[PDB]
Amino acid sequence: SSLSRAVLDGASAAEIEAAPVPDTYLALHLRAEDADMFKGVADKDVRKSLRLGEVPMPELAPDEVLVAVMASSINYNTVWSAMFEPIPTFHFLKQNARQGGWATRHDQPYHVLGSDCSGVVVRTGIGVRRWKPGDHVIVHPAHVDEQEPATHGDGMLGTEQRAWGFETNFGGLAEYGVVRASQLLPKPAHLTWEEAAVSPLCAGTAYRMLVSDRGAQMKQGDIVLIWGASGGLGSYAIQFVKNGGGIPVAVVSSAQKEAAVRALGCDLVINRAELGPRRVVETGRKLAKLVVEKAGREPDIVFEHTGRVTFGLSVIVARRGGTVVTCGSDNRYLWMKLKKIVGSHGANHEEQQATNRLFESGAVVPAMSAVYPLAEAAEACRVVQTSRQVGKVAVLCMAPEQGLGVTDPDLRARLGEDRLNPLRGLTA
Template sequence: MDSLTQALLAGAGPEELGRHELPSTYEAAHLLAADLGMFDGVADKDVRKSLHVGQVPMPDIAPDEVVVAVMASSINYNTVWSATFEPVPTFEFLKRGARQGGWAARHDLPHHQVGSDASGVVVRAGAGVRHWKPGDHVVVSCVQVDEQEPATHADAMLGQGQKIWGYETNFGSLAHYAVVRASQLLPKPAHLTWEESAGVLLTAATSYRMLVGDNGARIKQGDIVLIWGATGGLGAFAVQMVKNAGGIPIGVVGSERKAEALRRLGCDVIINRNDIGMGGDDAPTSERTIELGKRLGREIRRQVGEDPHVVFDYVGRATFGISVFVVRKGGTVVTCGSSTGYDHHFDNRYLWMNLKRVIGSHAANLQEQAECNRLFRLGHLSPVLSEVFPLEDVGEAARRVQNNQHIGKVGVLCLAPEEGLGVTDPALREKLGAARLNPLRHHGAPAPAKVS
C-alpha cells in the first residue's frame, strides 16, 4: 500500500495528506481496447469477462482538476454499456475527445477506467481550484462541462462539450483514485456512510431534473405520476420525490419481491406488470401497446380515479408506446435512457390529438445537482442502496445490474475497508433512523455506522 493511501486510511488531516506523493499507479476497474470485438456474434455479452481490475497509471492533473481518493462508488447502467462495447465502444468517445489536444489528449489510452458515481476525500487540488482542498469529504457529479462554451451558462446539459465522466471520459470512479474537475464536486452528506452517499448523485439528480426542476415535468401537489421500474435507482428516487412534492406515485414493478421493496419506500399504488399481461423486455406491437395501455389505464383509474399527469420512463422501447397512450390529455412523458432499447415506437395520434408532451432529459446541471444533494443533506431524501460489493468483485456487481437482478443501487467499496464508515454527523443519522436511511436493504440491521 502506498504512503498516501496508508495516511488516508489512518485518518490523516489535510496537511499530512499534502505531504505524501500521489501513487504512480493504483487499483481500478477498467476496460481494454484490446478486447474490442470480444462479444461479436455473442448473444450473452457477460460484463464479467470484459471488466478488469488491476493497476493503472496515475495521470497528470490539470489546473482545474482534483484527485479524489474514492472510498466508495456504485454501478450505473452506463458501466454496462461500456463493458458490452454497445451501443458505441466508449474508446471512440476517448479518441474523439482527445482530438481537442491539450489536457484532453490524456484520455485516449489503451484502458478505460469506468464509473460515474463516487464519494471520497480530496487528496490533491490543481492550481486553479478555489473552493476545494485536501481533506474535504465530497460526492462527485457525473457531468463534465466546457465552462468556456456559452450554452453551458444557460444550462450545462445543453453545451456541446458536456460529457459523462467515466463513460465519455477516462479516470472514472470504480477505482482507488479518480481524477475529476472541481466543478463536479459537492459536499458529502455528513450523516451518510461512504457507500450510501456514493449511490445517490447520478440517479437522484437525474430524477430531480426529470420531475422537479424547471427543465422537467415540474410536478406539483396532487400530481399522479406513473413510474416505470420503480425499484431501480432512478425509479426509487422518483418515488421519494413525488411523495415529497405531495403527489401520488404509482410504481410499476415486475415481481412480488420488488413490490415489497416498493412498499418499504412508501409508494401509494403498486402495479405488477405481470398482472396486466406485460412480461419481458420486448416492445409490444401497436395493437398490443393499445391493449396493454387500456389495461394499465383501467387499473390506475380503479385505484386512484384518474389518469396520470406524468409518466416517468427510463425503460424505453418496451414501455414508451404505453407511456404515451396512458398519460392523461395534456400530460407529460419525461424520458431518459432506454435500458430495453432506444428505438421507441408510439401511435402519434394519442400524442398530437391529446396535446401531450414528451420531454427528453439527461443527467442534471450543477445547480440541479446541488439542490438535490441539499435534500439528502437535510435528510429529506434517503439512499436506495440494496447491496454492496468489494472492488475486486465489480464484475459481479455490474452483472447484477446487466441482468436486472438488483433493486435500488448496487454499491462498490473502493478504498473504504468496510461498510459503515464516513459518518461525521451521527446525531442526524440517529434522528432519522436506520430503517428510513436504508429502506431497500435486506431485512435485518445494516452495517453499523462508524464515525470517521
C-alpha cells in the same frame, strides 16, 4: 501507499499534502484491444471484459481535483461500457481527445469506468477554488466545459457535456478518480461512504426529470406513473414524488419488486403481469383504467426509462396535456391530446446541489440494497446486468469496510439507521 493510509487514518490536510501521489493505482477498467470480443455472442457477460489492475496516474489539469475514492456504485452506463454497446467507449475517448490540450489524456489503451462516487480530496489543480485536501466530497457525472456559452444557461446543454467515466476516462470504480471541480459537492455528513456514493447519478437524473424546471416539473397533487419503479432511477423517482406531495403509482414485475417500492412508501402498485401492433392500443386502455381505479385520474406525468414497449404505452395513458419524461430511444396520442415528451438524462451542477440539499436534510434517503468490495466489482456489474437487484448496488473502493465515513453521528441517530436504508438486504 502512505497517501491511502493517511486518507484512511483521516489525517490532517498537511499530512495528506506531504504524502506522495503514487505512480499507478488500482482500477476497474476495460482494454482497447478487447473491443471486438463480443462480436458473435448472444450473452455479453460483463465479467469477461472487466479487468482489475494497476493503471498509470495522469497529470492533473488546473481545474481538476484528484479524489481518493472511498466508494462508488454500479450504473447502467457501466454495464453498457463493459458490453462495448452500442459503440465501444474508446470511440468516445478518441472524440474527447480530439479537443487537444488537457483532453488528450483521456485517450488511452485502457478505460477506467465509474460515473459516481464519494471520497476525500487529495490534490487540486492551481485553478481550483475553495476545495482542500481532506474535504469529504460526492462526485456527480456532469463533466462539462465552463467556457462554452450554453453551459451558462444549462450545464447539460453544452456541446462538450460528457458523462464522467463513460465518455471520459479516470472514472470512479478505482482507488482514485480525476474530476473537474464543477463535479464536486460536499458529502452529506450523516451518511456512510457507500450510502453517499449510490445517489448522484440516479437521484440527479430523477431530479432533473421530475422536480427541476428543465424537466416535467411536478407539483403537489400530480399523479405520476413510474415504470420499473424498484430499480435505481424509480427508487429516487418514488421518493421525489412523495416528498413533493405528488401521488406515485409504481409498476413492478414481481412480488420482491413490489416489496421494494412499498419500502419506499409507494402504496399504489400495479403488477406488470396484467398484459405486458393493435395490442399496444388495447393494453394502454387497460393500464389507464387501472390508474384511474387506483389514483383517481389518468396520470399527469409518466416516468419511463427502459425505452422498450413501456414508452409507447406512456404516450397512450398520459392525460390530455400530460407529459412523458424518458431516457432510452399512433400519432393521435401525441398531437390530438396535445401531449409532451421530454427526453432527459443526467443533471447539471445546480440540480445536483438541489438534490444534495434534499439528502442533507433526510427528506430523501439512499436506495442502497447491496455492497460489494472493489475486488468483486465485476460481479456487482453482472448482478445489475442481469437485473438481480432492487435500488442501487454500491462498491467499496479505498474504504476497507462498511459503515465508515459518518461525520455527523447525532444527525444519523435522529434520522435512524433503518429509515436511511429502506432497501437493506433486499433483492429481485
